[PDB]
Design an enzyme around this catalytic site. Structure first.
Site, mmCIF file in Angstrom:
data_model
loop_
_atom_site.group_PDB
_atom_site.id
_atom_site.type_symbol
_atom_site.label_atom_id
_atom_site.label_comp_id
_atom_site.label_asym_id
_atom_site.label_seq_id
_atom_site.Cartn_x
_atom_site.Cartn_y
_atom_site.Cartn_z
ATOM 1 N N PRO A 29 0.787 -1.238 0.000
ATOM 2 C CA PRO A 29 0.000 0.000 0.000
ATOM 3 C C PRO A 29 0.823 1.295 0.000
ATOM 4 C CG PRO A 29 0.076 -0.900 2.204
ATOM 5 C CD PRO A 29 0.764 -1.902 1.318
ATOM 6 N N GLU A 30 2.150 1.180 -0.026
ATOM 7 C CA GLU A 30 3.064 2.319 0.118
ATOM 8 C C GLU A 30 2.634 3.589 -0.621
ATOM 9 O OE1 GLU A 30 3.855 -0.859 0.265
ATOM 10 O OE2 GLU A 30 5.974 -1.240 0.633
ATOM 11 N N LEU A 31 2.337 3.485 -1.913
ATOM 12 C CA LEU A 31 2.077 4.691 -2.703
ATOM 13 C C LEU A 31 0.841 5.447 -2.221
ATOM 14 C CD1 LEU A 31 4.366 3.621 -4.532
ATOM 15 C CD2 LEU A 31 3.071 4.549 -6.466
ATOM 16 N N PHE A 90 0.076 5.836 0.867
ATOM 17 C CA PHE A 90 0.622 6.600 2.005
ATOM 18 C C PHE A 90 1.595 7.714 1.580
ATOM 19 C CE2 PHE A 90 -0.178 2.517 4.319
ATOM 20 C CZ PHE A 90 -0.963 3.018 5.345
#
Lengths: 269, 268, 268, 268, 268, 269
Positions: free
Chosen positions: A134-136, A138
């Protein structure tokens, strides 16, 4: 002796448990240090033939600890460099380990923890397990870009560019991220069977065979591609994406749940 | 030929691995004959494609362990030419200028699994099963094609655990097998594919396969394969105690008993 | 534009391949317009992602064979610029700094299949079908992306046999397609994905796509692609007798009859 | 330390290979101490660069053959850890985050030549001489750095002929040596270079060396080196009859006599 | 043009870097004009080759530090586009479809040394001198071509020490320079070479240069260069204290004094 | 038994002599076939430990036979493909040879013959020897693009793009194309000393060591780069450069000397 993990040896197998149940076993600085110490011990112990990594309770891990990041407020390239180096090198311990590594996943296996599992020789999971990066969403970049090496280009691009974070174990198995989906009541037993199976084999034979298997991907330049993605992430985080800055602005003011709600509202339903 | 059949039909060459009493196990003689047959197929302008299959109810169980038990090769210098012949014979099916099709029923294991992996396409019957049992009897992997054909996680599982009952349907899911067909339809399907290829300008097929193979060779596959072969030379030159133990039982009690001994070392 | 539609909506650019009477065949004019549209989309800071799709209930049948029949290019020097434009236009979708999404219904064949392969993601309707029929026409492969997207065995089967009816479901199994959707839900799904991307910091998306592409470029993909393109220049510069024969029928009895002649050469 | 000296001076670490009675031959103990010294240098923030040199009138003749004669390692499993330690110790000087400088006088041969090859820079006195005599006494090459440092033709000549008297000036011509200095100016020149490096922001030096090393690692150097190491394991695990013959003379008549026996096999 | 001269003569384009008062320092404006000139040269069918040289008895001292002092870029996002333009402008000379020839007198330093490294050939006068002083300024290397052009040991010495007085004769020894000529013979030699090239079929030259460049690109040079560029973005985005200190002196006492301050940090 | 080469064995060494003195030992189709037969014999003969290749008299070779090309008039891609394949594969025999190969050069070593020498493990030459690749001046492309792998980029580009064909042995030694320059009266003796030196070593040790040396360059992708250049040359020759067409037009009308004069007049003095 460890604060944020558990370490066991049994049946010639080492088992590492990511142990912060109240934070979904989030990987903070301290836990990464202890993982390195445990891997050192497992690698030095001739009685250990394989390593199982799992989370405490019914979660593997939500990834690198964002609450710790909110509080620490690292700013700039020089502050971020050692953080990312430790993240990356700890994950890659599971690839480089001379002994085979098995990730045994319940519940969430996300972000840095998804990468940790990707680095393991094998991954087994329960039906309830879910995966992704889910990094992107965030405003964070990808630290360890193993995904395109494990699942190939189209699927890797979808998961990372969209920040997919609810990929079910069944789908993870279809795309090659997970070896086996097992019954919930049988995960620990299955990981132990696999590890004890490996443990029955001449350790030198296993070691040399893993070396040869890893060489296939290293020959393709994987380690250079990974270092390149890490370099790109240093630029991303050293600058600080406005998406991440805004996320933590909401988080410090209204709390992390409110920040997640704010985040989710930016994307389609 | 003594251990294979070689046929040409309908512009297609067909090699049949032919020792049904030993599950078409690949011994030294058979490997030599496969090379002679591939030389023939490659030289024959009337041949447009090659099918390889096994006689009877099996493709092959792999390199002949009974022959190895009896020959007792010992040390690096003895093992070097054995592994080189194993490796180069399997890789004939990759390097062949003409397309190669593995047509598999029953067991396709170890060195034979690797032979099929090297072919441009593999088709299998519903009853076919695959894998790489080598590590379970103390042998290393001769031709490390698996991580180039299927994902890294899947290749590690099959090789490190010595999975040797991977069903055809699962082999298809992971990209080891192109098509699964009925048991009575294998030869017809293989020939249909080969004759389809045979309808095309041979130069066009040749250059297109060259380009296809180039994609993997660009990635360094041939260096990775040679590296794994050299690692295996050290493994076998030393001689794993697992293999030494296996053959001790095999000589004393026979191969059936040795397999029982082998399987008892692992979880049920 | 004459041969495409170009739209901007919700911070997304959408390119529609538009020659319904020729199944959106990619002729020289259309290729030029696609490049102009990509230039526009890439320069427009209000565009965050690009969707490519087809009009008239199809994506595209590929590079235009009727145009080729009429133009009669002959020899290496004539073919070089044609292949260069074909290849570079397809690769616009890989190199694009912004994410690209192929949204496919009906046929997606040959050069158009390659165009979709080059996109970051591909979505397809249940009725969509894919493949690379080139070798059946006596043509070589211009953009050999297939072995980089799907496994080697699967790529060899599709290209060497000229498979041109690969269903969307199968394309999803092998990793050519990300998602299969209902016929009436294609536009909405592509837009949801594009608008999701458009919510993210453009620099973050840009740098992350750079890192993702670097994984394949590190393996030497661009060299392998250029090598396959040079091999195709030799194939087309010489001219396969299969293609020469195909167009002999096409000029005499029409393309329809030429395709019937073509199909009769292969097993039913 | 017993077989090396370790000093820190002027923000520089200096390792001296210290067994002058044996031409500073690298035995097991010395290799262990080199690793301990490099660990120390790398951990010490007051150290900005590392110099390695030999005691007395020599850098080093390479790995200790007298120690090997006495230990009589036999077979693959015995040789594997010996070669791994040899290789990894030499490669410390490449992988070191801080710059490494070899300062050479007199002989710099075999494993010691490889150690110097791995350093970021090499400086040598006029009297220094270099090379890889391994093949002349039946040993293989442990660390195949030479073809990465000098041209392929030159590397093949040195290794295949076992050239072991390559003068410093010639070593400079081929890129093995950066600078040739006077015999009384070696330590001053090495320190000047190291202190120059030490004036620069350590992070800048670190990241720049990372980028420099990346150029060769991108080419696959580490895989090529590991491949050569595995080939050498087979060579030594088998035991060349040339080496067996050499040590037979060495045990019976001493090393001086064995060198005479060795040299008499080749043209004058 | 304001900061370059552009000439066409004898079927050759000649670009003269032209800011004699700043030793032809490459500022933003000059870089833009170089790109415009290269666009013109590449589009002009009457141009067969490109010569780049400097005015005012110098080639160039590199990217403009006075402009940098004034602009005060701060942080990753500010530096990214600056480095991108620097890098891409230098690499124009490598990627140019037509051959490029650097003709050097006097200083050829830093970014200008990299520009010359990117050219197909380099000719130099006896008085020319080369190098990469970046690390002495606290700057990283933007375009790390050096280890691709000269050996690894030599590249490490030049870059890690910031060597900036490498004479033409030495540059020729290490393969950075093709030919050294008399001061008054530079223009004539560059023109003879360019006109020689211009006598050859342009397509033949184009395709042969493609093949030559492919040799280095196959090794992964473009990935290694992009990696070094990303490393430099981190270096400059953070800002080395060495550079910050340099510009503190420069803003106070002038660049002249800052260079004197810089030199005093290192051995005389 | 050979018409266009000589084959000898002596002192455990095989020696191949390129033997057409009246055509500067130009490599025609027949000679390439015989070279392959000789290399097969040398490789199969356990009594042979190394291979020396040299020209008859005081020339190595001017390269692939242009007079034969003038007469044969190959036209188009399909005609050129097998010609170039045989050229390329014959040259590469000297690289791939399991036994070490030594080129011993007097006088001209040009074009395809320069490439043959480049492929050898070592090259020694007399002071009077000269090297280069004049192909582009003839309107021909490069068949075997070994040069950038042996001498590096700037020097390779100069030699090939300008068609340099008088590079003296001394300069060839400076750039790494030649190992040793020897006295004219001592070339054959020096090649034999080198070959007999190699012949004193355990053949398996030499074989495995050469494998490791060759692997260094093959790891870098050299074989793919070479195949790519060969593919490019097929397009060049299949089309036929107008420079080559014009060259042979003059050659058929006024003779090859007149064609060379015509060629040289196009370039600066």
């Amino acid at each position: 002796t460890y604060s944020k993990i558990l370490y066991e040896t049994l049946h010639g197998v080492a088992r590492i448990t990511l142990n912060r149940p109240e934070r979904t076993n989030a990987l903070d600085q301290e836990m990464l240090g202890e993982i390195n110490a445990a891997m050192d011990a497992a690698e030095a112990d001739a009685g250990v033939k394989a390593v199982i990594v799992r989370g405490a309770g019914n979660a593997f891990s939500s990834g690198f600890d964002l609450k710790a990041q909110m509080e620490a407020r690292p700013a700039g390239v020089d502050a971020w460099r050692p953080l990312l180096r430790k993240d990356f090198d700890t994950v890659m311990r599971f690839w480089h380990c001379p002994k085979p590594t098995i990730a045994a996943v319940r519940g969430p296996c996300l972000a840095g923890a998804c990468e940790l599992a990707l680095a393991c020789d094998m991954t087994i999971a329960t039906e309830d397990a879910f995966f992704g990066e889910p990094e992107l969403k965030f405003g964070a970049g990808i630290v360890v870009m193993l995904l395109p090496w494990i699942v190939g280009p189209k699927i890797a691009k979808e998961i990372i560019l969209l920040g997919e974070d609810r990929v079910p174990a069944r789908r993870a198995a279809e795309i090659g991220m997970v070896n086996r989906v097992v019954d919930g009541d049988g995960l620990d037993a299955e990981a132990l069977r696999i590890a004890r199976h490996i443990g029955a084999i001449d350790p030198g034979l296993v070691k040399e065979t893993k070396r040869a298997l890893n060489r296939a991907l290293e020959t393709q330049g994987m380690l250079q591609a990974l270092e390149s993605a890490l370099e790109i992430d240093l630029a991303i985080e050293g600058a600080g994406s406005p998406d991440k800055i805004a996320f933590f602005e909401v988080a410090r003011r209204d709390g992390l749940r409110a920040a997640i709600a704010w985040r989710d509202a930016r994307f389609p339903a």
